[PDB]
Symmetry: D2
C-alpha cells in the first residue's frame, strides 16, 4: 500500500519500543535505530529481533540501523539515506538525544563538557539537518526531538546537562518555526521520572522499594510515568492527527516541570 | 456498564461537538452543557438534538444542561450536582471559558473590565471549585480548562483579555499542582486561529478568502486549526491514556504562541 | 528647577519610604499615597510626618494622599488629578498593589476571591488607566507596578493570589508594549522574602529560629532589604534606563528564577 | 583603603567602555580584557590607551589583558590568575560572550555550528569556571554574563545562534542558583537593537531609512545606548542589589518581552 514511515532512534530502549508498537497500529512503517545484540547487552531493553516479530504482526515493515554515530553529520546523513532507500519517504521522525551527566558545576571536567555538547546539541543539530530536507520536499513532515524536562528548569547539580537541554529546546523552537511554512512540525518533549530500566538503575530505585517511594514523592503526581503514556503523547505528535503545533516544548514529568 | 463520565461545557460550539464524538468513542458517557435551541440560535453551531443522536450511536448516554450561569458559584455547583445525580461520577471535565474583547487599553470601559474578569477568571475559579471535589474523593480525575493562546503572549490591543487569560493559566498551574497528590490532573489549553464559525466571523473571514489568506499568513503553519485536531489533543488529556501531566499550559495556535 | 515628579502608593510602608528617599536624591518631586496616622496605626511602619522632614532635607516637595480607595476608578482618577494639580506633571509612577491571601484552593471563600481580584487586578487596571494618559501626552513616562514573585510561579496554597499576580504581570506586559511607541515604560516587579514588618509578622519570624528557616528557603540564604529593592525600583523610574518595557522582574533572592 | 575589583571582558567594545567608567565612579578597581591596538584595528571602538587615562581620572587602577583565548579553559584560567596577582581579589565580573551568526538552519555549515558553540557556550562554561572559585572562597561575588536577547525567543534565521544563547541562559540559571549558597550572584543580560558600531554596521544602518526601519521593529521605537546598558549592568555588579541570582534580563526595548 502507501504506508507512511516513522524513524525512531535509540529504539532498543526508552520510549522507542512502545512508540514503535503504537506507530505501527497507526499504520506506519518503521525505521528503528538502536543498539544491536540481545537483552544481555548494555542499553538494550528490548532487542531488535524481539521487536521485528511483534511489529510484523501489526503489519509493519521494519528496517534496523545500528552502525551510525548520531553525534556526527555523517552518521545522521547516512541514516536518512538508508531510510529513503528502503522506503522512499520520511513522514515522521522521533530523535531521542542526550546522555545524563550530573555533579557540581566546578567539578565538571572538559570531557564532561565535550560529551554533553555532543549528546545534547550535536545530536539535535545533525539530527534535524538530516530529517528536514526529505520533509520540506514532500511538503509534509512531523518531528519530535526528545530532550529533557531539565530543559525547562536547569537546576543545581545539573548545570551543563540542563543548560544544553535548554539550548536544544531553543533550537527546536527556532527550527520548528523556520520550517512551519513548508508544512512540517518539529517539537520537543522533555521527560523525567520515567518508569524504565534506565531511570530505575540511575536513581538506585531498582530493588529498593523505599528509595522508589522517595523518588515518587518528588513527582507532583506521586508516581513514575509509563512508556505507554509517553508513547501515546509522542505518537499524537507524529501520526498526522495534530498538525497545529510546532516549535514547542512539552514537559512530561508528572508536573515536576510545570 | 461502568463507563466513565466526561463533562464538556459550551458543547454547542467550539471544540464541544467534536470532543463529544471522540470522547464517546473512548467509551465515555457525556454531560454536555451549552445553549438550547436549533442551529439558527446565536452561539449554536451544532444543536443539542443533533448530538444525542450521534452520541447514542457510539454508545454514550448524554445529559443536557442549559439553565446555569457558569460565571457564578451556583451555576457551576448546580452543574456538578446534576452530573453526580444522573451518572454518580465525574472522571473528566473540559471547562470552556472566556469571552473575547479587544481594543486599546485606555479605551476599555468598566463594563468590559467586569465582563472579562467574569468570563476569563470567575468561570475558571467556580468551575474548578465545582469539578474537583468529586475527583479528589475518587482519587483520580482529568481536567482541561480552555483559556486562550493569548495567555502566553498578552499583546497590545488584547491587554485585559490576554492578561486575565494569563491569570487563568496561572490559577490552573497552582490548582493542577495542588491536587496532583490526589491523582487529579488539571491542565490548560489555549488556542487561536481555529477553523470554526466563531473565529471565522470575528476575523471577518467567513466570506472574503483573501482576508482568510491574510489570516493564515499570520500562522507559522499557514493554516487554521480544525476542531477534529483540537478534540484529539484535548481527548488525550481527558481519556486516561496520559496521567503524567498536570498544571501545564499547552499552546494550540499553529506555532503562533511558541 | 522643573523637577520630574514620582508617585509612590502605599508609601507609608513596604518599599515606599526607602524609594522616596532615593527618588528624592535623584532630584524628583514626590506624591506619597499611604495610610494616615502615626506609628501605632496598623499598616504604618514609617509615619507620614517623618518622611516630609527627611524628604525636605534632600530637597523635595511631597504631596500626601490618604483619602482614596485605589481599587476603584474614582480613587485612581482622583489621585492623578491631584498630582497634575500640585506639580502639573507625572513622569514616574510606582503602583504598589495587592494583598496576600493563602490557603487550600477548595477552602477559598467567595469573599477571598472578590478581594484578591480587587487588590491584585482592579488596582492595576485602574492604577494604569489613571497614570498613563498624562505620560502619553508628555511623550515620556516610566511606571513600575508591584505585583508578586508568586506571579512567576503560582504554587499550591497560593492559587488565587499567585494566579491573579500572574494576570497582573500579563496585563503589565501588554500595557507596557502597547504604549511603548509613546515613549513610556510600564514594567512589573514582584518580590518575596523581604525584610520588613509586613512579611516578618506574617511568617512568625519576628523567633530567630523561624527566621533562619525562612532564609533557608531563599537561594541566597537571606532576606532582601528595602534599600536594595528601592535601588532596583528607582533604576526603572529615574530615566537612566529607557530600553525596558512590558517586562516582569523577579526579586526574591533567586526563589522565582 | 580596599578598592573592590571588577573584571570586564571585550572592554574595547560593547558595554565594556561605558561600564568601566561607571564602575570606576562606584569605587572599583578594573581589569579590562579586549583586543589590543588602536581605533583602526577591527573590533576596537574605544582603544585601550584612551581608556586608562579616563579611569585613572576617576580614581581606578586598571590592568589590561589581550593575550588570552576566552573560548578555552586556559585563557580564562590565566585571565583570573592575573587578576588575583595584580589586585589579589575578584568581586565582580562582566563576561561578554558570543559571536553573531544568522541564516537558514539547513544552510549552516559544520564550522558555523562549531564556532557558535565556542562563542556562545564554551566562553560561558570556561568563564564561570574561572571567576567563580575566587568569589566562593571570599563568600561574596557578583557576575553578569552577556548572552543575547535572542536567547528568550530563538527565532527563524537565528536558529543555532539563538538556540545556544538559550542554553547559555540555562547554564547561568543553574549556576546562579547553585552558588547563591556561597553569597555569589550569577545573572544574564541579553540585549538587541543597540547603538554601537557593531550592530549599526551589521544591519546596514550606518542609511537613515534602514535605521528608521530598524527602530520600527523596536516597541520603544529607539536604539539602546551603552550608557543605559552600563547602568543596568553596574547595578548588578556594584553590591547594591544582592537579591537576584540565576536570572535572565531582556534589554531590547521590549523586543524580547
Ligand atoms: C579542555 C576543556 C574542553 O572542553 N576541551 C576540549 C575537548 N578536549 C578534551 O576534553 C581533551 C582534549 C580536547 O580537545 C579542552 O581541551
Ligand atoms: C459567590 C462567590 C462570589 O465571588 N460572589 C460574588 C461576590 N459576593 C460575595 O462574596 C458576597 C456577596 C457578593 O456579592 C458570590 O456571590
Amino acid at each position: 500500500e502507501n504506508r507512511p514511515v516513522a524513524l525512531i532512534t535509540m529504539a532498543t530502549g526508552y520510549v522507542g519500543p512502545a512508540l514503535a508498537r503504537t506507530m505501527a497500529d497507526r499504520g506506519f512503517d518503521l525505521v528503528l535505530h538502536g543498539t544491536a545484540g540481545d537483552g544481555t547487552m548494555v542499553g538494550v531493553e528490548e532487542s531488535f529481533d524481539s521487536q521485528i516479530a511483534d511489529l510484523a504482526k501489526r503489519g509493519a515493515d521494519v528496517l534496523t540501523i545500528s552502525d551510525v554515530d548520531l553525534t556526527t553529520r555523517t552518521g545522521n546523513q547516512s541514516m536518512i539515506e538508508r531510510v529513503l532507500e528502503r522506503f522512499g519517504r520520511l513522514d515522521s521522525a522521533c530523535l531521542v538525544t542526550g546522555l545524563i551527566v550530573t555533579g557540581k558545576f566546578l567539578d565538571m571536567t572538559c570531557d564532561q563538557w565535550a560529551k554533553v555538547k555532543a549528546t545534547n546539541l550535536d545530536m539535535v543539530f545533525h539530527g534535524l539537518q538530516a530529517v528536514l530536507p526529505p520533509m520540506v520536499a514532500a511538503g509534509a513532515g512531523q518531528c519530535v526531538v526528545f530532550t529533557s524536562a531539565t530543559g525547562g528548569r536547569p537546576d543545581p547539580m545539573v548545570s551543563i546537562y540542563g543548560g544544553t537541554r535548554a539550548g536544544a529546546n531553543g533550537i527546536v523552537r527556532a527550527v520548528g518555526l523556520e520550517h512551519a511554512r513548508h508544512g512540517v512540525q518539529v517539537n520537543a518533549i522533555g521527560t523525567n521520572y520515567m518508569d524504565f530500566p534506565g531511570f530505575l538503575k540511575a536513581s538506585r530505585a531498582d530493588g529498593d522499594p523505599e528509595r522508589r517511594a522517595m523518588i515518587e514523592a518528588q513527582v507532583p503526581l506521586r508516581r513514575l510515568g509509563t512508556m505507554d503514556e509517553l508513547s501515546s503523547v509522542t505518537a499524537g505528535l507524529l501520526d498526522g492527527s495534530n498538525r497545529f503545533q510546532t516549535g514547542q516544548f512539552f514537559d512530561f514529568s508528572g508536573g515536576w516541570g510545570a
